[PDB]
Amino acid sequence: FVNQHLCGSHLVEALYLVCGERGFFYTPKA
Amino acid sequence: GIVEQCCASVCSLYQLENYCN
C-alpha cells in the first residue's frame, strides 16, 4: 500500500504504519 | 525530499523507511 502517490495526511499515515515504534520524521520542505 | 519521492512520484518501502528513526 506503499507503492503509490502518497501525499499529505496519506504519506504521514504510511510513515506511521511502516515505521511503528521507531517513529519517523516528516520534512516536506526538503 | 519525501514529497518529490513519494507524492510527486511513486514511493517505495525502501524510501519510506529512510524516514524512520
UniProtKB/Swiss-Prot annotation, chain A:
Coiled coil: none annotated. It comes from the Eukaryota. This is Insulin B chain. The chain holds residues 25 to 54 of 105 of the full protein.
